[PDB]
Design a protein around this ligand. Structure first.
Ligand SMILES: Nc1ncnc2c1ncn2[C@@H]1O[C@H](COP(=O)(O)OP(=O)(O)O)[C@@H](O)[C@H]1O
Ligand code: BEF
Ligand SMILES: [Mg+2]
Lengths: 95, 86, 107, 463, 93, 98, 88, 107, 93
DNA sequence: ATCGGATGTATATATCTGACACGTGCCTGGAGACTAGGGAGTAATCCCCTTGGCGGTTAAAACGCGGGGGACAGCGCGTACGTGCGTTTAAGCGGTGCTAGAGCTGTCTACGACCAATTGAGCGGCCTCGGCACCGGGATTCTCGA
DNA sequence: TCGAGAATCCCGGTGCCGAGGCCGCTCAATTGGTCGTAGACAGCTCTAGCACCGCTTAAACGCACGTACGCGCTGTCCCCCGCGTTTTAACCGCCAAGGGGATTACTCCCTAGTCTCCAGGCACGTGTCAGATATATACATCCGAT
């Protein structure tokens, strides 16, 4: 087998190496159409607009998790927990 | 013609997808109570960007939200996105 | 008389007439001095030359010949001064610097 | 009047002061104020004090009687009140914010006093429990702080209420003749009370043709309204004075600093003023914070090497030790005394310094120990605005004005300080002027401001 | 409808700097948006520089002050030097 | 029989007193010497007005008060009630200013 | 006597004294401070004043003047995001 | 005829002529349509009416009848909407809200 | 040379809102800088709205879109209702 | 603490595959040459405003000694998460076909730019007074021993 | 448990000083003719988006197991706060000076604008070649018995 704490670092190297998109296309696109149909009904999306929203959302969540990891290593742990994210958005000025 | 809203699609940002977005960001070990919070955060961000994009699109009389509208919403909020135009 | 373009008088590579049109037909001011687009085109050439030189080295470090935005992501983010300039920019097809924290390494 | 030298004072008078008292007994008799502006040295205090008991023993109002003097000269008043008229109560309103409430509320306000002696800058901070009493006189002394039109102290002194205001001062006008009406406005508001109607009231003293009739139409209103007497008329010191100039040359070290002020080459200081930094560098070099070499502290006999005047000063001083004399050293900058204090502590010399903000009770003890017979402190370091305004220094003769101030009569206020009644030696004034430098043109400027008043007005004040 | 980009100009600079390097299409779009972004920053700072002083004309001098304000660190000295060399060579011809 | 408060009451009463009022918590003349010192490295021998030195003082108090709020949030997060240098270094790392 | 040589330039960032930093931290919310905040607070304050005074000196060197007015510090703070109301 | 101001036509309290001049002579656009200065004067009026109503109430609950910058700091940082608008903005002579976290209160 | 502000206009709006509660001069300077700030933000957003659509002219409609893009949440409804009512009241005369 | 070994990626190589660099046409913005003029440089005058330092208050920074309370290292111990196995279902792909809307254009027309005469709202400068800042003396309440 | 005692909230009187209100200019905001062209409206090509079908397979879901770590406790230890005397240096008010900001007028010359040639840039076919990608082999690296 492997010790608990090995496949984590192998996946970190595999994912900080490559450049693909990490959310499936059609669930994210149906999420976008759901949130869009409360502001104007019957909208249409160019495919590059859905790609742009997916790229902006992935960049937002990845930077958020870097800063949450910094807070959790500050609090003498190795594990993120929801008060770390709520701290990391209280400091940044987005709450 | 027709329109429907289906399945309560915030459950499309699934558990291995959030775990891949955390394994990229440098996190080793994830709790089990993050997942509702991550879904809530992503929903707030998409409401803001799509609110501003639909504002521009209803202004310029179109309906097809082109990529320049989303890029200008992101430039408005303070996060430039190179790679798509303008 | 013939023609002698301002991009050959100044000794540049980036144009001049297009920047002069985009200063006088974009309403940045009322009157545009004739000296300004030469200076502005030279500065845009300098910044483009810096990022393409660093990107060429970072692409040669993985032994390919065509620069792709993974290489621009690494070439912008490793150097500290360009990282200060572009601190907010999200580059599509981006990639991340490989950074692992200090306590996560095994004991 | 008064040909009997009235000895209700417990002391003497003088055959010229008796004539001075008759000018004072007539102004209240005619209900007008005055300016007792005699040339300094002839005892304006005794003419002031004998005026007081005249109104106590003849006109017989005991009165509250506010006087105001600068900080150093306060101890000189309460001695000579009690040396001459010991039947009069007095103060020396001092202390902390604690120690003034017992004086005012418990010991002043219950009518338990005669005479208050406050200072310039406590009369601002305690003005609210001092407006209640109607006064008899506000006997301001050394009245040159009231030369501004909208200063703080000139603004408070139009709210006090009294009969008269003896603005008993030392000198007349200093720079303009915009000055002297502001002295005369706060005397008596019934004469002018008007600013714009004074400037051309006499044609402004010769900005048109230099007529010498312009000064006549002045002096038919204020010659019998002001008193001022000639020195050699009275034989004030039984001796004249001799001002001497001693041109010195700059050292090369301060010349390297000098061309880093004009051409602007320890370094990189704030050199944002030109006339003030050059007043430092052509007096003593070490004021630029780092010109002292070597260890973090260490003197060395070299101190007279770098400075252009210390070889000139101490050779002049070791002349004077061989003659058996005592000197008075003045200054304008306070920090230059810090070098001379460490200087005579290095080359064995005893001293007393009266800087600004020594203390109050410390200025008292130094003066008595310096005026004692067979008290052998050789030098006595002073400053201009703190010390040279009315302390009594009859037991030292020679003066070394280390620098010239922009006011020509600031040093003239201070030259004649020791040179008063009681000085029996030969007063020798020495001015140290740095030749081919900036300080001559601030001495050239000072000559013109003095020749306007000493040669035009004094020839028309004796007339 | 033609569109104003900057593919061929960046491509000339690239063939000067590294003589045997190709460049893919998304990188060309990124360099297009990069040059447009830096253009809009410098023109914006120069515009409200020349409006703050109550003047009315963008000279080269406000461009130099805009570049000394925006570009950080050791890019300012090289950028100002490149610009002054270009304009000084321009005046002689 | 003296009268000493505890180790946790004078600080609280100062907190309410200083959140209630709006003076300048930094003195004037040390700050003015500081600003002239830092200005005489960039261009030599400048002159200031007085209200511009007031402006620099007001912005510096705003930035430091916001900095100590965010430091205190990280400190109460880390199971302490004390601030420390690692907390200020964290709360400047998170904002994107380093 | 050795009194003149201690007037020296003091490294004037020590003008921001210890009770000043404690009054800022008492207003801000902190109940209890450590004893090593102080070096770090002077470091942060010197970084912030370097950046704002650098932009103010650039705006003043532009219009040929030698008098850094209050409008220049307001424009330098508006430059960086932290807007300041109340001066012009 | 006799002059009748457009502020009096629109029923506003802001100088619509001054807004129209600052929109032509700012180079915000080439040509300013006539409908825009009236609209913009109205929006500025409504924002000032909001902040002054809130400032008046927060000043009046402290028994002081003139508005000083402390009252504006309270009347902005209390309400969530104007807090969301005025995010970065520092107000001079302003002071900080009463804001103490929960664990520092005594046992 | 005159400094011109919006002092009397803020003062008139204060007299229409409250009956007596006067204002102090430092708060007048703050309200001056606030109104200049909001005017610069709304003019900038409507400006480059009219630039993105390849138009040349600020209408009322771009001001309405810029008010929906700057004022957050529920100031937007009241501001756009006030704008429409003031312009329509202006239209008849 | 060290070899056997078991399993991860890494890489040399071979075959297609689109993506790129390059050859040719079309033409619309860029150079250019003369003109018309209003903004901006430049010299002179002048006059408010800054600067350095000193003088006398007095509130605040500094030092030292003592003391209770928070930081923190170790110890136990209970649980929540990583790792693995199998099953399923939904994403991806490719391909078809329909069609709603977006981009370009040709042609009027009402809408703002420009100027010219004019007069009143707005702003600098000067009185005059109500809000308020102390200002010290009283009354209420919270803190800390018992 | 239930007292004594300092910090803080009010209260009436003062006195003070910055706001409210007028006075007298003055430049810019209204009105009223005139053009000139950006913009709306009807009208078409044409193409990219939506809907939908089946087919393959790799990724999500769920479950069971083992254990590394989160958390409470607990004792130690050192250190930061509180208190009270000290020294000192900031603060407000002189007191001179002059460099520098702000007008003001005069002239000078660089840019806007115009029409007229004319080639650099953009779009569209086409050769061609760096790279994706599967197969086989090989090198590093965790993990366990002695
Ligand atoms: N009648 C007198 N007898 C003795 N000494 C006198 C007499 N009158 C004046 N003095 C001397 O005058 C000095 C005080 O004079 P002062 O008032 O300082 O003069 P001024 O007012 O000109 O400075 C004292 O030293 C005192 O000895
Ligand atoms: F003022 Be006297 F000369 F003591
Ligand atoms: Mg005397």
């Amino acid at each position: 087998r492997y010790r608990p704490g090995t496949v984590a670092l192998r996946e970190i190297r595999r994912y900080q190496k490559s450049t693909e998109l990490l959310i499936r296309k059609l669930p994210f696109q149906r999420l976008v159409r759901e949130i869009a149909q409360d502001f104007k009904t019957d909208l249409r999306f160019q495919s590059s607009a859905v790609m742009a929203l997916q790229e902006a959302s992935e960049a937002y969540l990845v930077a958020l998790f870097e800063d949450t990891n910094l807070c959790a290593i500050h609090a003498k742990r190795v594990t993120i927990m929801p008060k770390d994210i709520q701290l990391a958005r209280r400091i940044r000025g987005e709450r | 013609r027709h329109r429907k809203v289906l399945r309560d699609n915030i459950q499309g940002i699934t558990k291995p997808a959030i775990r891949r977005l955390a394994r990229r960001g440098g996190v080793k070990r994830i709790s089990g109570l993050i997942y509702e919070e991550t879904r809530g955060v992503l929903k707030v961000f998409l409401e803001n960007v799509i609110r501003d994009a639909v504002t521009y699109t209803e202004h310029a009389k179109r309906k097809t939200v082109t990529a320049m509208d989303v890029v200008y919403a992101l430039k408005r909020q303070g996060r430039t996105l190179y790679g798509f135009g303008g | 008389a013939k023609a002698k373009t301002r991009s050959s008088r100044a000794g540049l590579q980036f144009p001049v007439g297009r920047v002069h049109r985009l200063l006088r037909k974009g309403n940045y001011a009322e009157r545009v001095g004739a000296g300004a687009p030469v200076y502005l085109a030279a500065v845009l050439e300098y910044l483009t030359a810096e990022i393409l030189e660093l990107a060429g080295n970072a692409a040669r470090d993985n032994k390919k010949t065509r620069i792709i935005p993974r290489h621009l992501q690494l070439a912008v983010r490793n150097d500290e001064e360009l990282n200060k300039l572009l601190g907010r920019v999200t580059i599509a097809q981006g990639g991340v610097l490989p950074n692992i924290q200090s306590v996560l390494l095994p004991k | 009047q008064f040909r009997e030298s009235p000895a209700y004072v417990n002391g003497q008078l003088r055959p010229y002061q008796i004539q001075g008292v008759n000018w004072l007994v007539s102004l209240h008799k005619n209900k007008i104020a005055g300016i007792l502006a005699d040339e300094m040295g002839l005892g304006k205090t005794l003419q002031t004090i004998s005026f007081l008991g005249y109104l106590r023993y003849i006109e017989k109002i005991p009165g509250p009687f506010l006087v105001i003097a600068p900080k150093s000269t306060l101890n000189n008043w309460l001695r000579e009140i009690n040396r001459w008229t010991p039947d009069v109560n007095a103060f020396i309103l001092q202390g902390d914010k604690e120690e003034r409430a017992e004086l005012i509320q418990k010991k002043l306000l219950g009518c338990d006093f005669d005479v208050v002696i406050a200072s310039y800058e406590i009369i601002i901070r305690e003005k609210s429990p001092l407006k209640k009493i109607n006064w008899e006189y506000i006997i301001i002394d050394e009245a040159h702080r009231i030369k501004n039109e909208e200063s703080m102290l000139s603004q408070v002194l139009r709210e006090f209420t009294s009969r008269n205001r003896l603005l008993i001062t030392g000198t007349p006008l200093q720079n303009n003749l915009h000055e002297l009406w502001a002295l005369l406005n706060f005397l008596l508001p019934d004469i002018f009370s008007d600013a714009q109607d004074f400037d051309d009231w006499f044609s402004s003293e010769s900005t048109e043709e230099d007529q010498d009739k312009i000064v006549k139409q002045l002096h038919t209103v204020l010659q019998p309204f002001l008193l001022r007497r000639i020195k050699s008329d009275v034989e004030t010191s039984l001796l004249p004075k001799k001002e001497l100039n001693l041109y010195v040359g700059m050292s090369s070290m301060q010349k390297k600093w000098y061309k880093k002020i004009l051409e602007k080459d320890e370094s990189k200081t704030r050199l944002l003023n030109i006339m003030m930094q050059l007043r430092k560098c052509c007096n003593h070099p070490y004021l630029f914070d780092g010109a002292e070499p070597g260890p973090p502290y260490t003197t060395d006999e070299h101190l007279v090497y770098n400075a252009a005047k210390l070889q000139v000063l101490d050779k002049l001083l070791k002349k004077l030790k061989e003659e058996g004399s005592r000197v008075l050293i003045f200054s304008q900058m306070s920090r230059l005394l810090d070098i001379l204090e460490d200087y005579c502590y290095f080359r064995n010399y005893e001293y007393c310094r009266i800087d600004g903000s020594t203390a109050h009770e410390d200025r008292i003890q130094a003066i008595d120990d310096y005026n004692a017979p067979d008290s052998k402190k050789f030098v006595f370091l002073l400053t201009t605005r703190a010390g040279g305004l009315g302390i009594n220094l009859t037991s030292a003769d020679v003066v070394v004005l280390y620098d010239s101030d922009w006011n020509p009569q600031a040093d003239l206020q201070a030259m004649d300080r020791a040179h008063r009644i009681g000085q029996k030696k030969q007063v020798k004034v020495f001015r140290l002027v740095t030749d081919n430098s900036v300080e001559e043109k601030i001495l050239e400027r000072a000559t013109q401001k003095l020749r306007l008043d000493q040669l035009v007005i004094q020839q028309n004040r004796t007339s | 409808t033609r569109k104003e980009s900057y593919a061929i100009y960046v491509y000339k600079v690239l063939k000067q700097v590294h003589p045997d390097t190709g460049i893919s299409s998304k990188a060309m779009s990124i360099m297009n948006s990069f040059v447009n972004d830096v253009f809009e920053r410098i023109a914006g700072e120069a515009s409200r520089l020349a409006h703050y002083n109550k003047r009315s004309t963008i000279t080269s001098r406000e461009i130099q002050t805009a570049v000394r304000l925006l570009l950080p660190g050791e890019l300012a000295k090289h950028a100002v030097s490149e610009g002054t060399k270009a304009v000084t060579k321009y005046t002689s011809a």
